[PDB]
Design a protein around this ligand. Structure first.
Ligand SMILES: [Zn+2]
Ligand SMILES: [Zn+2]
Lengths: 101, 149, 129, 83, 98, 149, 25, 106, 91
RNA sequence: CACAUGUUCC
RNA sequence: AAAUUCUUGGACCGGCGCAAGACGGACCAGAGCGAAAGCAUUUGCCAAGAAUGUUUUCAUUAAUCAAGAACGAAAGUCGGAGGUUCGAAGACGAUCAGAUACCGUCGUAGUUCCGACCAUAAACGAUGCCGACUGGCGAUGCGGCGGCGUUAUUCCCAUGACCCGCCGGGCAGCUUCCGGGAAACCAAAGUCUUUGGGUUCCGGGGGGAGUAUGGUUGCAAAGCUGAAACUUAAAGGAAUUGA
């Protein structure tokens, strides 16, 4: 039977989209079908962010961040717990999880 | 609902209900006709006489002011062209696609586009055969169509 | 494209009757449809209709009552003899107490009772009850 | 809702509907009495004239073709007419 | 503006007076009747220079046409190549005013 | 005879004595009879116009290239073959030029080459079908065709 | 047996019948 | 190329800005607007670099003086905000003679 | 009528030389005797007289071209490339 | 990093 | 996890360059275009196209179509060019009872460009094409219309960028007892036992079998049409509860 109305992708009027590889494996996944994660993160998070600050020559120097646009496949994201299975009524919800931490 | 396109657009003219002549128009039927004869003498397809007359001369419709329409007036005086205007512009468009296809023969999209006009030309060709405005043995020949502009 | 005109008019007012609209507009106006509407009005199945005669195919606004169940159309217009006209209404009308099959004859357009009175057959148009 | 006044549609929504989809098919175009500041003579111009309009004696241009209504030359007084 | 010239040429063919060919058009420059000269780009360079010298004495404008003689005949509505075209009477066209 | 590349007779004017000097050039593809072919340093860059390599822009297609200044052309002169300019070097008056074998050779900037590919290209794509065509080909060149293993 | 490989087995078997019938003629 | 033989390949970047009162999430621009932005966005480089040699254009790279002009000149096309010149690449230098380097070093 | 099914000019070769050699010869053999449009006169009078030369039957004008075709695909690309660098030098 | 398979009736 | 592999003959790494061939990230979206396949660096040229606007022209010229024809993913074939990366086959090192697989190092064909074949895909919206009607709701693409106002050229009208609405269709989404369906679900999969708007293609339990044979195309691979003998009482679809 039909599990998803959009068949787990954003392709509606195209019919063909360019594939992209994965981060863990080299799986060829369509761009709209891939689970895309964009993570804003510092180079150092909790411990190394402190001791480098007094070790920095330039006082009051903000540490640069790192930007990585992640592209996971269906098997890779679920195994790495990026996304998880939901109930038939919980599938239709597509709002992002709340962001506070 | 275009017959050679998947588009279903709705955009065309809509004449008002009243067929009476406008109150701002003081040009009589013969003065409109001599204006029509002036535009037709210098070379102009009947589509364009109707265009510029409502722009500068301020006429609503030629059929309401005069007794006849634009092509019918030219047919009475013999100023109408040898072949109708919709077939002429289709042949002109078909020549340009074929001329473009001579250089860009890799253009498969333009190659597919070529059959559509020749499909559209033949529909107009056999229709005008039944209306007896074309000779019964007239046939659109692609190689000799470049002589006609 | 629009092949049949009466078929589009009858189904448009049948969709409005199912929803129960007080009045309904049909986009084409034809002589057959006007004759079709006059057949139903003498029997009181619908409310009073009017046409808007512009300089094109006119538009007809038909007031509706709640007395209409279904007004169908039979395409193509099969010719109907006097012998099997009972056979046509057996498998089309709900009952013999009511239900009207209208069909065009040389005398005009009328229901199946009046065609029996004038003893004239013709081609079928549609059914309504 | 069910009951509507198709007999007598209100002015406010009649102009809102599409020009072909009106109860009576009426255009949205019109004509106006354009008077350029360069000269004196009154010219009749279509609202969607889509063509170049030039004054008498080639004094100044009047209207520019656009996708919709023709753009009037600035300073040209115009008075919309009807019949 | 190239397509406009083909429309002017088509208008002259049906209404106005014209002379086709090189030798017959060279006489019309010499009688002074022709006002505009059309020359294809594939005409001989000796013939290109002689036409312009003939027209300079006659004060006749020369319009060097874009393409070759093969398409110039089709632009004139004919079925043969034409290198030199001379317009005797435009009649009802604006070809000479552009 | 014995050479697939056509030859062109070019006639010059002697600048010191009242005489006309003729040469036997190697015809680049596109050369027609009755055409001014120029020869010198101040020459323009078009097909069939020999000028020194050091004046040429990058990637110029040439043939009949001199391998030494003044030896009247030795390199890249078979039918359908050509040479390209790789890179210039203003000092030491040298220029890298590749050869149809694919090898890249540093050559002086003083020598010259005629711009274009040699006419008669594509000769080897036609297969010889019978022994007669190959017998007549080598008979004009030398006695080397019948090869016993 | 997947439906894909039984089609591939048929084509290998059909091609085998092509060579066997060809040598007899 | 500058007045001297310093021939450069410059690179700039632009970013359309969501307006303060804009409610629309997309905030995109038309394709012809991008082509109309980039034709003004390129000619500014040719105006700043051709008129002088390296000493002033480098002095224009310490601030965003090339990128500031690009941001304000294209406000009539689309109000882009996040404009800088992103990369300047050396391509061809003339002959190095030591006298040129001294006035660049005091 | 149509004399042969799928062999044209290579029908003179008979059953010799194989099908594929006769097939690839056919494209070259047809083109080396076909006539091409003159760029000077316009009359189609480009006939191959020898290897690499093409002569005009109207202008009496010999043009140095390809071995089998009037213009090879490589030489046309060179002519566009040389003209592009011609105006690049003098601006 | 491997976890291959175990005749039938209710 | 190791090994196959390179390495004092200097591997790996850093810097400056050079050359080659692929590819076009982030911007990139339940967005746009195209009949479909499909289409993403800048710019120029050529021809084409939908929608909008139109008091412009003709006046039924229209809808679906067997025969026929054009295009047609990837893989594959034939000639050349080039072959960076990846990579069928194959070699080697691991794992296992065995790997002839999954893992790792190489790597032919191929993957890249041009000219010809090939016409097959889960070529899917698993939903033929034209016409009408049947609830709303917020978006979004284009074009047009109207309107307070903020903001640029600056010197504002008008044009740009926003904001508030309306119109046509363009891809969609949300919502509900319209209605339907075996249900999953569907603004079409509704307007159907109250059964008829028009026109093509196609199916009759499951295998045999898309097989044999015959015909036809193709260089080949294979493409189109296409059985019977015989065997079988179930196969299958949706949904519920356990395991
Ligand atoms: Zn993955
Ligand atoms: Zn000639």
């Amino acid at each position: 039977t039909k599990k998803r109305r959009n068949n787990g992708r954003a392709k509606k009027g195209r019919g063909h989209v360019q594939p992209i590889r994965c981060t863990n494996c080299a799986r060829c996944v369509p761009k709209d079908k891939a689970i895309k994660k964009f993570v804003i993160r510092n180079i150092v998070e909790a411990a190394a962010v402190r001791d480098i600050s007094e070790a920095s020559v330039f006082d009051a120097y903000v540490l640069p961040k790192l930007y990585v646009k992640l592209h996971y496949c269906v098997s890779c994201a679920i195994h790495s717990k990026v996304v998880r299975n939901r109930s038939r009524e919980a599938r239709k919800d597509r709002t992002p999880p709340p962001r506070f931490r | 609902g275009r017959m050679h396109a998947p588009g279903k657009g709705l955009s065309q003219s809509a004449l008002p209900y009243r067929r009476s002549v406008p109150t701002w128009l003081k040009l009589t039927s013969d003065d409109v006709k001599e204006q029509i004869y002036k535009l037709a003498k210098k070379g102009l397809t009947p589509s364009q006489i109707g265009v510029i007359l409502r722009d500068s001369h301020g006429v609503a419709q030629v059929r309401f002011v005069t007794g006849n329409k634009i092509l019918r007036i030219l047919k009475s005086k013999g100023l109408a062209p040898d072949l109708p205007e919709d077939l002429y512009h289709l042949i002109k468009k078909a020549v340009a696609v074929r001329k473009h296809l001579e250089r860009n023969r890799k253009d498969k999209d333009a190659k597919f586009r070529l059959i559509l006009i020749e499909s559209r030309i033949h529909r107009l060709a056999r229709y005008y055969k039944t209306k007896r405005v074309l000779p019964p043995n007239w046939k659109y020949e692609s190689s000799t169509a470049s002589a006609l502009v | 494209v629009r092949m049949n005109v009466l078929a589009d008019a009858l189904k448009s007012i049948n969709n409005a009757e199912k929803r129960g609209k007080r009045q309904v507009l049909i986009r084409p106006c034809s002589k057959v449809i006007v004759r079709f509407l006059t057949v139903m009005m003498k029997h009181g199945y619908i409310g009073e209709f009017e046409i808007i005669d512009d300089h094109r195919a006119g538009k007809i606004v038909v007031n509706l009552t709640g007395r209409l169940n279904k007004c169908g159309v039979i395409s193509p217009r099969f010719d109907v003899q006097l012998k099997d006209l009972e056979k046509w209404q057996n498998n089309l009308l709900p009952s013999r107490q009511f239900g009207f099959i209208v069909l065009t004859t040389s005398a005009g357009i009328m229901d199946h009772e009046e065609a029996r009175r004038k003893h004239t057959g013709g081609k079928i148009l549609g059914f309504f009850f | 809702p069910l009951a509507k006044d198709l007999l007598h549609p209100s002015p406010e929504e009649e102009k809102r509907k599409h020009k072909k989809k009106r109860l009576v098919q009426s255009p949205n175009s019109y004509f106006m009495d354009v008077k350029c500041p360069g000269c004196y003579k009154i010219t009749t111009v279509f609202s969607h004239a889509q063509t170049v309009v030039l004054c008498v004696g080639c004094s100044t241009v009047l209207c520019q073709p656009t996708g919709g209504k023709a753009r009037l030359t600035e300073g040209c007084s115009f008075r919309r007419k009807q019949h | 503006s190239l397509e406009s010239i083909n429309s002017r040429l088509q208008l002259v063919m049906k209404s106005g007076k014209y002379v086709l060919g090189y030798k017959q058009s060279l006489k019309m420059i010499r009688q002074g009747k022709a006002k505009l000269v059309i020359l294809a780009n594939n005409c001989p360079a000796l013939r290109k220079s002689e036409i312009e010298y003939y027209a300079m004495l006659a004060k006749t404008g020369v319009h060097h046409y874009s393409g070759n003689n093969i398409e110039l005949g089709t632009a004139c509505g004919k079925y043969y190549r034409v290198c030199t075209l001379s317009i005797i009477d435009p009649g009802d066209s604006d070809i000479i005013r552009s | 005879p014995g050479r697939g590349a056509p030859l062109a007779k070019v006639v010059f004017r002697d600048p010191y004595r009242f005489k006309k000097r003729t040469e036997l050039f190697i015809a680049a593809e596109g050369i027609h009879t009755g055409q001014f072919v120029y020869c010198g340093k101040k020459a323009q860059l078009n097909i069939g116009n020999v000028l020194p390599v050091g004046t040429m822009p990058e990637g110029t297609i040439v043939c009949c290239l001199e391998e030494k200044p003044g030896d009247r052309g030795k390199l890249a002169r078979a039918s359908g073959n050509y040479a390209t300019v790789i890179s210039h070097n203003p000092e030491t008056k040298k220029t890298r030029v590749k050869l149809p074998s694919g090898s890249k050779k540093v050559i002086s900037s003083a020598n010259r080459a005629v711009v274009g590919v040699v006419a008669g290209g594509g000769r080897i794509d036609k297969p010889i079908l019978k022994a007669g065509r190959a017998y007549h080909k080598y008979k004009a060149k030398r006695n080397c065709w019948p090869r016993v293993r | 047996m997947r439906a894909k490989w039984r089609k591939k087995r048929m084509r290998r078997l059909k091609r085998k019948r092509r060579k066997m019938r060809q040598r007899s003629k | 190329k500058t007045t001297d033989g310093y021939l450069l390949r410059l690179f700039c970047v632009g970013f359309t800005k969501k307006r303060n009162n804009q409610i629309r999430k997309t905030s995109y621009a038309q394709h012809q607007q991008v082509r109309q932005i980039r034709k003004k966005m390129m000619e500014i480089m040719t105006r700043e670099v051709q008129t002088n040699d390296l000493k002033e254009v480098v002095n224009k790279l310490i601030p965003d003086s090339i990128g500031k002009d690009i941001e304000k000149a294209c406000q009539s096309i689309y109000p882009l905000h996040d404009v800088f010149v992103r990369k300047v690449k050396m391509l061809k230098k003339p002959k190095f003679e030591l006298g040129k380097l001294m006035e660049l070093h005091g | 009528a149509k004399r042969t099914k799928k062999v044209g000019i290579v029908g003179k070769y008979g059953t010799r030389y194989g099908a594929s050699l006769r097939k690839m010869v056919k494209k070259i053999e047809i083109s080396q005797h076909a006539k091409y449009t003159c760029s000077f006169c316009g009359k189609t009078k480009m006939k191959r007289r020898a290897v690499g030369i093409w002569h005009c039957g109207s202008c009496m004008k010999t043009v140095a071209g390809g071995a089998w075709t009037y213009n090879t695909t490589s030489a046309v690309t060179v002519k566009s490339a040389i003209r592009r660098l011609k105006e690049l030098k003098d601006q």
